[PDB]
């Protein structure tokens, strides 16, 4: 299988060879390989999507197809590689973005192939190659994505092995990456466990940690549209994405109108105190989160606690305190609690507890510039969406490019090609200021 | 003593308090505190400089005074904090540079107070505070710099403790910083030992590793000016700075002219094979580098092996192979070997071995754009100076700002305020595109 | 008198000589001359201000002193001159901002010395010199400013005649500028008559035309603060500035609260229908605008129609239709009509008529992002201030730099040094891309 | 015929209607219409090219096809429309690029359809429409291009009349454009006569004046490659383009080698003093330039003075003084004199006379950074190409985008969408700085 290897040392070596050609390739040559990856991704997004659902049991196909199309269209390519110039009496100074080399990447089972392909477009654009240690739940999907990219590069004249992976990811294979001297950067896209581990590797780690994104709704909001956007956003790929709304905080005065709209127009099903407890018991085990529930549609989750509901039901909503464990905990499930709030200031405090100091993602619906500003300042997230669904944050219905590696922990924010370069200052003294 | 504390947990706590005021300070308020730090630095550069020489035994006062003046003048302040905007049908998207929080910093005995103050200007500009664990050889100097900054902030209305330090740095106090949960970023300015250690901390580490900067001189160079620039650059603060030229590679045809110029006009003293061996024996011990020699002027080093020379001698030069240990090893001494080369291509290969894969700093004298380009591409350093002394790389006689934390390992290059921020995307959907 | 000449051909020649030195001056040399102009301006703003009031009869001293301090502090200098770089396989391409040469400038009697000095800072920063043909009402003031700048440049090592003027401006002297072959650019800061004339000169004309800036206030606005900001803005330097609010459009529901606040807290005096007609008769003559009224404080204007009012009265307000000639006409007087509006959409239409297709300046008080966006899009002005006084538009209490030459007609917007340069592309083929 | 009208007032009105839809179109909608124009241009470049040659008698088809493909590929679209943001304590300030409206354009018979289409892509990207008054020699070609664009916009959902023209251009129809109140900007791409006329119109004129681009070759140049590049560049589309090399200045020592290479490898034919005089008599008439010679290939021009030469001859070269009228005069003919020069400084002086103060285009072959810098500074052109053919200046084999409207006179340089917008500052006070 193309770009896939029996072990990590082989993956890294192959990748290191290809990178010697990649660092000397023009922008035009890289952009061709990248253009063919975009094309290959679109052509196979149906295959990639059903693979992920079939292998992991999570998410759904129509949303995963859109995810893959967003990656192909809006992931930055070589236009993201830029140069700055200062010139004056003392000459010209240039600052460039040079390659790192072979980058290691650790990728999730939620957006497995989206991450792999987004990372590669970016990383390749900057003259890097990349070696993946994919989540073992999504290994087939992941290595299919890898094989696609090499197909795409083979199509565009080469080289082979711009992206490599291993046939069987383990912890041993990931330990070998993180102590490999040929690898100076690792991008970690995953939970806190893996991110922490890369920032202990002795290499620079770009760390995409977790979150619990709240969405604030105040009384100035368009409430009908707020309902629509929040469910759309929460339920996207069955709540798998890190950015998706996972709990609401509603100003008291409009909280009934919002929730009403949610039931009556957005396919929401309000559960009783009783039903809340059996669902909590289901989705939160003594072992932590229920892997069998993560990324499951709401009809399926309701069905699992013996509640039969119409096929047009797509989200479980209820009103609860912020400590409610379906509210305080990141579930990656179309399960959305509403937390009622006395005041905007109380709303901000509740939202901030709920975000859990992650400074990952948070959302607001308000038409009031002071309100937005207040919330923005206090919540201090890598991402803030105002009056749209969360996925606007990655260019689905909002300005800006797509990524799947949001580096909230180590601070690079929404990663692109430029993230994965080294800065190089070039000082041409006392010449080449033409003024 | 102001900003200085008995232990690291106290340092960090004080710093964390001040940062709560700093993150809500305007740019104008930060820039005032920064303006007063610049002023305080200039007023006390004579004191800072003689302190460093007196405490460490290294460098010299006139050059250290200039180093401090460069920091005050050319370290970026709040103008380095920038914002990007994308607007279109789907609204306005902003990307901002938000504070990290309390940054930890580990600083050297070579440019102790320069680093402390440069870091602080940058870090403060971005809404951070900073806690230092200074090199223990330069603790007095370092903590004097710290106390100055708090004086400067006290002068500008507060707050106290924007920069903190410890009375007695140790390895215990640095371990406490690197495992402190209140600290998400550490800037490490030092050798590979300390940098490696911060990249194992579980936090993002900005890593300023070591080097061995070569300077290539070809036959198109202005040779008389190349002589002048290289000695000036090599001998600056007795070769302490990471960037300074520490070995030459000369195209054979002009190597005699260069070296001749060096002796006859630049205060160089050519040593014999005999004298080379006693100096190697002196400056390289079974314990590694001779701490008693590092940063010593050439008259002093010559004197230590019983060679008496006129006061106008400032650099030891000789012709040798690249493996010669005064040539291959970073000495931080005004000791500069010349390596003769058949051809430009041979010159590039020699220079590349000598740089030792650090991708730190390298230099060239050539008037030929293809030559410069060839060398630049192959040497791939964070810094490349063409036809000037190395310190042009930090704005002394070259375009661009000053830093003392050149992050060659982790890839941020010449650090400034913007380095020490987190990126924040703000998506204002379907409003505030005024076009 | 320094920089001032008997005739325009002499002015231009002297300016052309100085420019030969200016185009070869470093940024540091220009910035020194500029730094001394900033300093000289502050030191003499009291003199400049009382000169203008005393010579023209217009405005007031305290506000003119602040105007001059804004120019000194916030007019961009040589940091406004920037360079862009594109590098790739085909080499390096630079784009620079090169000088025009000798720029001609035509300046107003409202902000005479502010314009002269702002233009010069900018123009000098870019390697130009400048020749002024000052408004004849403010010739003394204007040529004093000129003489100051040459004093400032003399102080900083030269050259003399970076700014020149004529002892006696006329129409003949301005015709000679506009047909002078040594002058490729003219900046026209004045009414439509002079701007039109420069755009007929055969040279590039940068055209700062007139306006009638409306300020919209809706029901979401902070009304008490809206009152404060609008009077402060309208009455600044007795309404002389082009940007200042000159009429209000108020959403009906809060129009009484706004106007009430204006009378009770902002020193406003509401006039009756009767009093409106005698003031209209006063300030609008068969000859057009009453030169004896322009830039007069409200107590003085009220007094002129025999209405005695307390010294604490600073603005004349009344409610009227938009066609009311104190509302529809730019008066440059602290005379501010309020136009009541059924709805936001009606408010936008009224404001748009009132702006008169100038696309100059307009203002809004609203906390609603859709409202702001709607208004912004429809009014389409070079300048839009939201929830502040108009002078925020030039950095008094708002982000961004200062100018006094707002080129609304020819489209360059708020002029700075970069405006007054020529773009130069430099294509270095197949070299100096170091990546 | 689509977008073409019987008279100019109709053209302008139709254009003004379409622009009301264009100013409210998203970037995505504009970029679709633009994408279809790019596609339509490529599909019909063979038709456009042979039309121009057949109608004007000038240039050649293979080069015109490449010209059209460069326009389609490298003319900037809506990515050229950008936004700047400043945020701080006082809020957020945005600067946008808003539409002008209906732009008038005057276009040449040399690159008729290239100009029309390049202008339109740019102008449309910024929310403008455009009305053309095409050169009457190339009216069919020009109006075919116009009709294509409307075809392209019709294909992409509309609107019709984004570009308009007249069936029969005259001076009356161009006078009506230049005095039309619905038109605030005119782009003039043509000789000095038309540019001067637009800068007398009372509107902002963007003025693309003429030139005489010299190419300097010194002794450090790659001479064989210099020969190749200069002929390729000079002879491109039979020397029609404004940018093309039209005379050489050669350092004496390598001038024979260059010229030798030109004859022996580049299809050059050296003419005698005798033959020079009959060609001068041919191509320069008492009426000025010979319209029957402009843009004719060298075999044809040689043939016209009775000199029969092989089909492989593409350029007429000779050695002459700089005043030689085939050297000093812009001919737009593959006629290239070599001017021999004592020294680089003499070479620079000769080149500068030859450029004739146009500050249009100039070229150099030198590997020496000080040489390039010296020449660049003294020649001060909108365009400078180093070591490539001139057409690198527009992205054929050099970094940067394509244009056909190089505004050398009025200073905007290489025009793109951003040129044809008005700047708009938006000051959001004391809100929407999220930091």
Numbering used by the authors:
A (entry chain A), B (entry chain A), C (entry chain A), D (entry chain A): 28 to 462
Reported in the publication:
The overall structure corresponds to other members in the aldehyde dehydrogenase family, with a catalytic domain (residues 238–427, highlighted pink), a cofactor-binding domain with the Rossman-fold type nucleotide binding architecture (residues 28–108, 127–237, and 428–447, highlighted grey), and an oligomerisation domain (residues 109–126 and 448–462, highlighted green). The catalytic and nucleotide binding domains come together to form an extended nucleotide and ligand-binding tunnel that is open at both ends, with the catalytic cysteine (C269) at the centre of the tunnel and the NAD+ cofactor binding at one side.
The proximity of this residue to the catalytic cysteine is incompatible with the formation of the correct geometry for deprotonation of water for resolution of the acyl-intermediate to produce a carboxylic acid product.
